[PDB]
Each structure stands twice: as structure tokens, then as C-alpha cells.
Amino acid sequence: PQITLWKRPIVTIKIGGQLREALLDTGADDTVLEDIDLPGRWKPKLIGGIGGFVKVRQYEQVPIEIAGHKVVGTVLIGPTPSNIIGRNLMTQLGATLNF
Amino acid sequence: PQITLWKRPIVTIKIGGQLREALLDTGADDTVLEDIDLPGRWKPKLIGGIGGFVKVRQYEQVPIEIAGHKVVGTVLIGPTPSNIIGRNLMTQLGATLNF
Numbered sequence: 382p383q384i385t386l387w388k389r390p391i392v393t394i395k396i397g398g399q400l401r402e403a404l405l406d407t408g409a410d411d412t413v414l415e416d417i418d419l420p421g422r423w424k425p426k427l428i429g430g431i432g433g434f435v436k437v438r439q440y441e442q443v444p445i446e447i448a449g450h451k452v453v454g455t456v457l458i459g460p461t462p463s464n465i466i467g468r469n470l471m472t473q474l475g476a477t478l479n480f
Numbered sequence: 481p482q483i484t485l486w487k488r489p490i491v492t493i494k495i496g497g498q499l500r501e502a503l504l505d506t507g508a509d510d511t512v513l514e515d516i517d518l519p520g521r522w523k524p525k526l527i528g529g530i531g532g533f534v535k536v537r538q539y540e541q542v543p544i545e546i547a548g549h550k551v552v553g554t555v556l557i558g559p560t561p562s563n564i565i566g567r568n569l570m571t572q573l574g575a576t577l578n579f
């Protein structure tokens with residue numbers, strides 16, 4: 382698809398058999414989800430945004446479906462006011478910004 | 481232009497006779513710049529990001545050039561680890577996300 386930016390670029394995701402929504406976020410290097418429990422081993426990691434920093438669980442080689450496209454990559458789990466898909470996964474969709 | 485997302489989508493801006501760089505940020509509703517002082521009246525505003533909240537100055541009807549395109553709109557000034565161009569201004573470029 383091609384979408385305009387008059388509203389937030391929210392898409393449907395499926396991860397670990399759970400369905401959620403997430404914001405396509407060209408400002409975010411990495412994907413961050415709050416409302417999802419993932420199984421298996423993880424690494425503690427601190428991410429920085431506007432206002433300060435949050436402790437996140439880093440999960441690697443996570444299968445995730447984004448707007449219908451199966452990819453596998455790194456998903457961070459921790460507090461975020463919005464689930465965000467970052468460039469780590471948007472590059473696997475071949476996503477582009479156009480203006 | 482069309483850009484891919486293997487690197488951060490950074491563009492050159494000109495605002496108030498000052499040249500800066502900023503991130504094209506589909507995850508950001510509003511534009512936020514740190515490293516620039518703007519003239520005239522403003523309104524206090526609090527914005528929320530991943531890591532809490534910051535106090536910003538809201539400046540309205542600010543002339544700004546983004547990757548060569550003159551627009552006028554609202555610019556928030558306050559602490560941000562990266563200057564960000566949000567959807568408020570990217571909609572004036574006719575920007576789209578494609579995948």
C-alpha cells in the first residue's frame with residue numbers, strides 16, 4: 382500500500398499468535414511493543430526517547446506479520462505509549478518515504 | 481524524492497535563517513526542534529514520548545523549508561535528542577509511506 386500522513390500510520394500486526402496494532406515509525410530505529418508477552422530468552426536493554434529512558438526486553442528472531450508481510454527480526458518489549466514498528470522491520474517490507 | 485529506510489531519514493531544514501538537520505518522523509504527530517531559538521510569542525506545551533514528558537514552546541505559523549519545500553506551520557521548541565519533522569509538516573509535502 383501507499384498511505385498519506387493525515388492520520389497516524391497504524392497497521393495490524395500478528396506476533397506470537399496475538400493480534401495488535403502498531404504505528405509505522407520512520408523516527409524509530411527499533412520496533413517496541415508494550416501489550417505483548419513473548420516466550421524464550423531475552424537481553425535487558427535501555428532505550429532513549431523524548432522525556433528519558435525505558436528498560437526493555439530485547440527478543441531476537443521473532444516472527445512477526447506486519448500488514449500481511451511475514452518478517453523475522455528483533456522486537457523490544459517494554460513501556461511505550463504506542464506500539465511502534467521501527468526501521469529494523471520496515472526495511473524488510475521495502476518501505477519508502479516519498480515526497 | 482523517494483528514500484529507503486536503511487539509514488535514518490534525515491533532511492536539511494531552514495528556519496528563521498538557520499540551517500539544521502531533522503529526522504522525517506511518521507511516528508510524530510508534531511514537529512519538535514531543540515537547537516534553534518525562534519522569535520515572537522509562544523504557548524507552553526507538554527509533549528509525551530517513549531520516556532516521559534518534556535515542556536515545549538509552541539510557535540505557530542512558522543515559515544520552514546524542508547528538503548527545499550517552503551511550508552508554514554507549527555513548530556515546537558524544546559529538549560529532544562533529535563530534531564524531528566512530524567506529520568503536521570510532512571502532510572504539507574504530500575509525503576507518503578509505501579510498501
Ligand SMILES: CC(C)CN(C[C@@H](O)[C@H](Cc1ccccc1)NC(=O)O[C@H]1CCOC1)S(=O)(=O)c1ccc(N)cc1
Pocket residue numbers: 404406407408409410411412413428429430431461462463465467505506507508509510511512527528529530531561562564566
Ligand atoms: C527521536 C525520537 C523522538 C524517536 N522516537 C520515535 C517517535 O516517532 C515517537 C514515537 C512515539 C509514539 C507515541 C507515543 C510516544 C512516542 N514520537 C514521539 O515522540 O512523538 C511526540 C513528539 C512530537 O510528536 C509527539 S522514540 O519513540 O523515542 C524511539 C526511540 C528509539 C527506538 N528504538 C524506538 C522509538
